From a paper:
To understand the mechanistic basis of the impact of the F319S mutation on the self-association and aggregation of Nup98FG, we aggregated a 30-residue peptide, which comprises residues 298-327 of Nup98FG, into amyloid fibrils. We subsequently optimized the helical parameters and obtained a map at 2.67 Å resolution. Each layer of the amyloid fibril of Nup98FG(298-327) is formed by five peptides in extended ß-structure-like conformation. Four of the molecules are oriented parallel and one, located at the edge, antiparallel. Side-chains are tightly packed without the presence of internal cavities. One is generated by the 300FSFG303 motif, which forms a four-phenylalanine patch (purple). The second one comprises the 317GLFG320 motif, which contains the mutated F319, and is flanked by two additional hydrophobic residues (methionine and valine). Together they form two zipper-like hydrophobic arrangements in the structure of the Nup98FG(298-327) fibrils (orange). In contrast, the tight zipper-like arrangement of the FG-repeats in the Nup98FG(298-327) fibrils facilitates hydrophobic patch formation with higher stability per residue. This may make it more difficult for nuclear transport receptors to open the FG-repeat meshwork in order to transport cargo across the NPC permeability barrier.
Numbering used by the authors:
A (entry chain K), B (entry chain P), C (entry chain U), D (entry chain F), E (entry chain A): 317 to 326
F (entry chain V), G (entry chain Q), H (entry chain L), I (entry chain G), L (entry chain B): 299 to 323
J (entry chain R), K (entry chain W), M (entry chain M), N (entry chain H), O (entry chain C), P (entry chain X), ...: 299 to 324
U (entry chain Y), V (entry chain T), W (entry chain O), X (entry chain J), Y (entry chain E): 300 to 309
Amino acid sequence: GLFGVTQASQ
Amino acid sequence: GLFGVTQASQ
Amino acid sequence: GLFGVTQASQ
Amino acid sequence: GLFGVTQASQ
Amino acid sequence: GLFGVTQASQ
Amino acid sequence: GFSFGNTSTIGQPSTNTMGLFGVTQ
Amino acid sequence: GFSFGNTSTIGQPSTNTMGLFGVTQ
Amino acid sequence: GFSFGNTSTIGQPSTNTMGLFGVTQ
Amino acid sequence: GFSFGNTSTIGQPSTNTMGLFGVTQ
Amino acid sequence: GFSFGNTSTIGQPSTNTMGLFGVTQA
Amino acid sequence: GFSFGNTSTIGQPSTNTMGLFGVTQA
Amino acid sequence: GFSFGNTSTIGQPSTNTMGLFGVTQ
Amino acid sequence: GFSFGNTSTIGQPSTNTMGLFGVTQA
Amino acid sequence: GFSFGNTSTIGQPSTNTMGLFGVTQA
Amino acid sequence: GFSFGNTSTIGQPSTNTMGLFGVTQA
Amino acid sequence: GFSFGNTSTIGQPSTNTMGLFGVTQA
Amino acid sequence: GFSFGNTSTIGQPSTNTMGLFGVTQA
Amino acid sequence: GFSFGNTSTIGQPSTNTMGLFGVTQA
Amino acid sequence: GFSFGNTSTIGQPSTNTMGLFGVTQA
Amino acid sequence: GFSFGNTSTIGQPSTNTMGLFGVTQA
Amino acid sequence: FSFGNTSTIG
Amino acid sequence: FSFGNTSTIG
Amino acid sequence: FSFGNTSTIG
Amino acid sequence: FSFGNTSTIG
Amino acid sequence: FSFGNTSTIG
């Protein structure tokens, strides 16, 4: 169960 | 179950 | 089950 | 169960 | 159970 | 003479990889 | 003469890898 | 003469790796 | 002559690794 | 007069090898 | 007078090999 | 002549590692 | 007069090898 | 006159090897 | 006249090897 | 001889083998 | 001889093997 | 001889093996 | 001889092995 | 001889082994 | 200059 | 200059 | 200059 | 200059 | 110059 994971790279 | 995962790269 | 995954690259 | 994890790298 | 973990690197 | 301009070798890949694996009985 | 400009070798990959593995009975 | 400009070798990868592993009975 | 500019070798990786491991009976 | 100039090499492999195998549901 | 100039090489392979194999449902 | 500029070798990795391990009966 | 110039090499492999295997559900 | 110039090498491997294997649910 | 110049090497491996294995649920 | 020039080589041979060797499924 | 030039080589051979060797499934 | 030049080499051979060797599943 | 030049080498061989060797699952 | 130059080497071989050796699960 | 993995799988 | 992993898997 | 892991897995 | 792990797993 | 772990696991 996954709810709202965020993976961001800049 | 996955709900709203986000993978962003810049 | 996948609901709203986002894969973005810039 | 995962709810709102955030992985950000700059 | 995970709720609001934050992983940030700059 | 025999000069060159401002050279640039830019390699910028933008890949989106997604593997979906499922075995159900 | 025989000069060069401001050279640049830029390699900027932007990869998005996602593996989904599931076995259910 | 025979000079060069301001050279730059920039390698900037931006990877997003995510592995999902599940076994359920 | 035979001079060079301000050189720069910049390696800046930005990786996001996430492993999800689950066994349920 | 010898200027060896600039030699810039960048190796960035993206090997994404995924595999699900060896699942015996008896 | 020798300027070796600029030599720029970039290798960025994108190998995405996926495989599901060896599933025996008896 | 035969001079160089202000050189810089900068290696700045930004990694985010997360391992999730779960066994439930 | 010998200037060896600038030689810049960057190796950044991205090996993402994932595998689920050897699951026996008897 | 010998200037060995600048030689800059950067190795930054990103090996992300994940594996779930050897799960026997009898 | 010998200047050995500047030689800069940076090794920063990112080995993230994860594994769940050997779970026997009898 | 007189071999003047920069040598900047990238060797990345890729060999991806996902196989079934000596497998007796059912 | 007279081999003048910078040698900047990147060797990254990739060998990814996900296999089944001598497996008796059911 | 006269081998003039900088040697800046990156060796990163990758060998990823996720296999089943002598496995009797059920 | 006359081997003039900086030697700046990065050796990072990667060997990742996640396997099943002699396993009798059920 | 005449081997002039700086030697700046980084050796970081990586060997990651997560395995099952002689395992009798159920 | 030789490029190629001598591989014998099997 | 030799590039390639001598690999014998199996 | 030799590049490659001599690997015998199995 | 030799690069590669002599590995015998198994 | 030799790079590589002589490893025999198993």
